[PDB]
């Protein structure tokens, strides 16, 4: 009740977000000869992201292009720090399995 000390004990919406130099939206493009290797690398990078507490938005894929085929994957990233970005991309560089094409391109 409004006049009682327990007023607002049940409100919940303020706990739900129903909506210092830092990067922008980052797209990591993974084009690989193997669907298997591309998917595995996407899983590994997503695990690193959610273990390091990086806001990951999308992990979709581009349509396949034929000219054999190369499978494409996307990883969205937002929220980096000075040392944190350095460690992140150096780890990505050092943990690239075999003949994979990374990217740090942005939206559009």
């Amino acid at each position: 009740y409004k006049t009682k000390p327990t007023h607002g004990i049940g409100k919940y919406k303020h706990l739900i977000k129903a909506e210092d130099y830092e990067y922008g939206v980052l797209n990591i493009h993974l084009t690989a000869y193997d669907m298997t290797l591309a998917e595995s690398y996407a899983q590994y990078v997503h695990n690193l992201c959610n273990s390091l507490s990086i806001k990951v938005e999308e992990s979709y894929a581009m349509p396949t292009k034929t000219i054999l085929t190369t499978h494409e994957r996307v990883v969205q990233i937002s929220g980096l720090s000075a040392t944190f970005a350095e460690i992140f991309l150096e780890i990505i560089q050092s943990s690239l399995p075999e003949g994979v094409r990374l990217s740090v391109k942005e939206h559009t």
Binding site: D34, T36, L96, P97, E98, G99
Partner: protein
């Protein structure tokens, strides 16, 4: 550590046999690729 996610597999259910074919693009960089009909050697002219 460039092998932790190389020993990984397709997680779908509709697919045919895949084989480790060695591929070279233009300069002599042999890489395993999951390709049908094992050629064991590929080169792009």
């Amino acid at each position: 550590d460039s092998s932790r996610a190389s020993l990984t597999r397709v997680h779908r259910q509709a697919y045919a046999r895949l084989y480790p074919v060695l591929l070279v693009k233009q300069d002599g960089s042999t890489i395993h690729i999951r390709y049908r009909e094992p050629r064991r050697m590929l080169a792009m002219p």
